[PDB]
């Protein structure tokens, strides 16, 4: 062939922390269909937002927004337990269909995005340059988001484990641990990567008895 | 400058499933130091293996091995709870130091890798070509590893939640759910991505009562 139609920019979704997670890489040949499985961030969460993005930046708000929809009716479950399968499907016509299916509830919602959507060529090449210029800033934002989500998961798990421990956990431990979850939860509200790790570290340091009781539980 | 020393290949570690996780990207200028935080895969796991790799393939066994060491003395904890911080540090001399520090125990182990280690230029360019040729196979392996780890996490969480539920969970639910965990645990032992999702899906479908009881618990 003298010609290929390829994706000039990556296509994906915004995930927790405001990051673009790619489903279809830049320069993938049409037609194509990719899927990935995602979950909820909170206990009892009943819907997820699917924000569809085009571009090469690690920050979602720095990419082009192609549209957004929600899938609701997610049944009550602990966070990270629902299986929401997101499929990006680009047909031979260059039309993108993005669906999300809850594998428990069977419920599905879809957005369809015309082949003329998104960034025009001047913007496309502006985007490839901006991604290139900014590899450092975006790497730093990617690592901060990944620390913050780890801190959140640690925040959430340790609270659950305090719960299932109840009386097994000595008075002094619970006080040290709860003090740490409060400062951790504070730190999570800033942009200081070292401060979040310092609060996560304090928590690892005071939670050793809890960790044993939780390991022993199961 | 007329000259830069840059990393000719990515440098990283093997993570769960046999995948290379990068800490220092290809073409990063020396000197440089990057860190990322990782955890255990099993309840009560007392050590982690740090296998250091050079190259651009998503499969660890397809990259160059620069060495390997363990950090032990990890105190008993539920999986995913220990914070093992891995730092890749390349000094002005092109020497790589890779340390792992347990933030709870304070324990640290290190390997130091001379600037002459790893792949020579012919191998370097053979590696960039092989990565390039194989983007599809590696993407497929990356998605299979990510499904398998999700299935494992779901396997493990649902068992824990069966536990903390005990009598709250009706007889019929526990039987349907345990049948599913057995087939899920079977599927995890193959290489069939669809079969693992089908078993994870069966589990989402029978666990709805459990998910409510677990959500209600906390």
């Amino acid at each position: 062939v003298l010609l290929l139609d390829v994706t000039p920019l990556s296509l994906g979704i915004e995930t927790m922390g405001g990051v673009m997670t790619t489903l279809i890489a830049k320069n993938t040949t049409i037609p194509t269909k990719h899927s990935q499985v995602f979950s909820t961030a909170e206990d009892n969460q009943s819907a997820v937002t699917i924000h569809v993005l085009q571009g090469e930046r690690k920050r979602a708000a720095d990419n082009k927004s192609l549209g957004q929809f929600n899938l609701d009716g997610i049944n009550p479950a602990p966070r990270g337990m629902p299986q929401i399968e997101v499929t990006f499907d680009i047909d031979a016509d260059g039309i993108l269909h993005v669906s999300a299916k809850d594998k428990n509830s069977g419920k599905e919602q879809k957005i369809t995005i015309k082949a003329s959507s998104g960034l025009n060529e001047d913007e496309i090449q502006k985007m490839v340059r901006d991604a290139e210029a900014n590899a450092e800033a975006d790497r730093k934002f990617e690592e901060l988001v990944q620390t913050r989500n780890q801190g959140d998961h640690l925040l959430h798990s340790t609270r659950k484990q305090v719960e299932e421990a109840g009386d097994k956990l000595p008075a002094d431990d619970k006080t040290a641990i709860e003090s740490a979850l409060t400062a951790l939860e504070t730190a999570l509200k800033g942009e200081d990567k070292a401060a979040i790790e310092a609060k996560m570290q304090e928590l690892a340091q005071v939670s050793q008895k809890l960790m044993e009781i939780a390991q022993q539980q199961h | 400058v007329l000259l830069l020393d840059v990393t000719p290949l990515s440098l990283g570690i093997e993570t769960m499933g046999g995948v290379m996780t990068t800490l220092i990207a290809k073409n990063t200028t020396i000197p440089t130091k990057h860190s990322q935080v990782f955890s255990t895969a099993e309840d009560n796991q007392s050590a982690v293996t740090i296998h250091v790799l050079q190259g651009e393939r998503k499969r660890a066994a397809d990259n160059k091995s620069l060495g390997q060491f363990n950090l032990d003395g990890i105190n008993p904890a539920p999986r995913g709870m220990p914070q093992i911080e891995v730092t890749f540090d390349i000094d002005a001399d092109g020497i790589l130091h890779v340390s792992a520090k347990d933030k709870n125990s304070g324990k640290e182990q290190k390997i130091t890798i001379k600037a002459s280690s790893g792949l020579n230029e012919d191998e370097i360019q053979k590696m960039v070509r092989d990565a390039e040729a194989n983007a599809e196979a590696d993407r497929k392996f990356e998605e299979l590893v990510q499904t398998r780890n999700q299935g494992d996490h779901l396997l493990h969480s649902t068992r824990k939640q069966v536990e903390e539920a005990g009598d709250k969970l009706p007889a019929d639910d526990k039987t349907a759910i345990e049948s599913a965990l057995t087939a899920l645990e079977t599927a995890l032992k193959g290489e069939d991505k669809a079969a693992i999702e089908a078993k994870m899906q069966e589990l989402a479908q029978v666990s709805q009562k459990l998910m409510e009881i677990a959500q209600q618990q906390h």
Partner: peptide
């Protein structure tokens, strides 16, 4: 009501 979580 929240973006998806990369699991």
């Amino acid at each position: 009501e929240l973006p998806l979580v990369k699991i």
